[PDB]
């Protein structure tokens, strides 16, 4: 009951969500950036603070230089990830690390030495009673109330299709696609600027993020949808600049998420998202495939587009053997699946016999993460 409860920390490329096990939603969701002034700064209503972290650095992003620790799901910068975590405990949840076990999540296929460095930091640097590292797609599955299935996880920096047999991700059949939400904010701004629009001032580079999230749609049939842009009337919608000015968006709204299905739109040779779910399924055990088609779960902010469940269904139904029951699952709380799957898991009395304890870390060293976290 609150003070004592593990803290679930979900470490996303664009966003971090952190809270307490047994809770329904993340208590702190924040931007995954560290921003240092690159000109000796400090407001005189703060210490000589030259790294702002999370959202208090979003609102000075324009005056600051921002480093992204997590990248395509993997941590590229270890002291700036250390900063983020210190801010998670000591400023966002207002917690003490040495009294709470932590469940940290991690990327499917996360490099060996990364798993060990986050075991390392957490134990030696934050003196954690215990910890566990779960793959993100597997907590998306548990939170839908399922144990076998394949999750299609699309965040800001990566997409993976993960087949899971009985709570265990099958690493050989995991496939990674480096095209997710940022790729789609970027491509939206270029097709909007191609229409002679002007997103010239800093804040307003972040104003394409809201058009993208507010007006984009996934088309069932891109082709009959494009001529159901030329039979206009109802497709153009408008967006208002801070500047007072107006935007009008039409074929762009559905042409943006389409780069997920056809990454040729982006200039990428990659298969789209519908083929990658199908190619992980083909790499799995012959006797669980029928289970993986019946349990295709989508999770992550980039899966929030209207039409994506239907269009994912339509498309997997075309590649799949002519009989498979294909059940695409798209729980309405799926921007937060990885965090509430971990909150469930780290609250079961089941889980306390599943952590790596301070004792064990001493006993073994950092290597033990490979043994116990699968």
């Amino acid at each position: 009951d609150d003070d004592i409860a593990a803290l679930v920390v979900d470490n996303g490329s664009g966003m971090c969500k952190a809270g307490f096990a047994g809770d329904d939603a993340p208590r702190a969701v924040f931007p995954s950036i560290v921003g240092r002034p690159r000109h000796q700064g400090v407001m005189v209503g703060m210490g000589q603070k030259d790294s702002y972290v999370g959202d208090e650095a979003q609102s000075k992003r324009g005056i600051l230089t921002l480093k992204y620790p997590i990248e395509h799901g993997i941590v590229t910068n270890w002291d700036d990830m250390e900063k983020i975590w210190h801010h998670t405990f000591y400023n966002e949840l207002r917690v003490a690390p040495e009294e709470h076990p932590v469940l940290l999540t991690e990327a499917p296929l996360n490099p060996k030495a990364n798993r060990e460095k986050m075991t390392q930091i957490m134990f030696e640097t934050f003196n954690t009673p215990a910890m566990y590292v779960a793959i993100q797609a597997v907590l998306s599955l548990y939170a839908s109330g399922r144990t076998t299935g394949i999750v299609m996880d699309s965040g800001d920096g990566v997409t993976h299709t993960v087949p899971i047999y009985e709570g265990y991700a099958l690493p050989h059949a995991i496939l990674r696609l480096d095209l997710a939400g940022r790729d789609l904010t970027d491509y939206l701004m270029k097709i909007l600027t191609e229409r002679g629009y002007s997103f010239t001032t800093t804040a307003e580079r972040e104003i394409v993020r809201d058009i993208k999230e507010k007006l984009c749609y996934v088309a069932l049939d891109f082709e009959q949808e494009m001529a159901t842009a030329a039979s206009s009337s109802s497709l153009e919608k408008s967006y208002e600049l801070p500047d007072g000015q107006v935007i009008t968006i039409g074929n762009e709204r559905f042409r943006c998420p389409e780069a997920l299905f056809q990454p040729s739109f982006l200039g990428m040779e990659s298969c789209g998202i519908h083929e990658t779910t199908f190619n992980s399924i083909m790499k799995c055990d012959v006797d669980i495939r029928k289970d993986l088609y019946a349990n295709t779960v989508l999770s992550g902010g980039t899966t929030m587009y209207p039409g994506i469940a239907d269009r994912m269904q339509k498309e997997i139904t075309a590649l799949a053997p002519s009989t498979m029951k294909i059940k695409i699952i798209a729980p309405p709380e799926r921007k937060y699946s990885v965090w509430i799957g971990g909150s469930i898991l780290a609250s079961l009395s089941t889980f306390q016999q599943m952590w790596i304890s301070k004792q064990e870390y001493d006993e073994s060293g950092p290597s033990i993460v490979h043994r116990k976290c699968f």
Binding site: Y165, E166, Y168, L170, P171, H172, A173, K283, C284, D285, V286, D287, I288, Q353, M354, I368, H370, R371, K372, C373, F374
Partner: protein, 139 residues
Amino acid sequence: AGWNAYIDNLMADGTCQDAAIVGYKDSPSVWAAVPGKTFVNITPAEVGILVGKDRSSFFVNGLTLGGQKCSVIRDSLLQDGEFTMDLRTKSTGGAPTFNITVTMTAKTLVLLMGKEGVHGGMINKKCYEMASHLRRSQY
């Protein structure tokens, strides 16, 4: 009593339901196994699969251990300083399934099956600590 001290050891704390030591060298041969359970029955063919040069078709096709069918979850059996392959058992007719780790030491293959509800990591960690004690023995 010999290799049996390892297996009665593995079994000591009521998390496993089976254990076995298998010389994979020359003709594979079980050297100690929990009597009358599955691994007492492992065979050369299946050993050949566990230590096979083809490290991939066991992912689609599956493998049997005893006559028990099993999905391969991780395989880092032949990989240095890893030595483990982790497996889960396939069911029919609703029966429970079970995690398995196999650890290759210099000569031995130590396998150990969890009871229902025990998590793949307890097994991996336990079967690996036991096997360490084979590898630091020229076994």
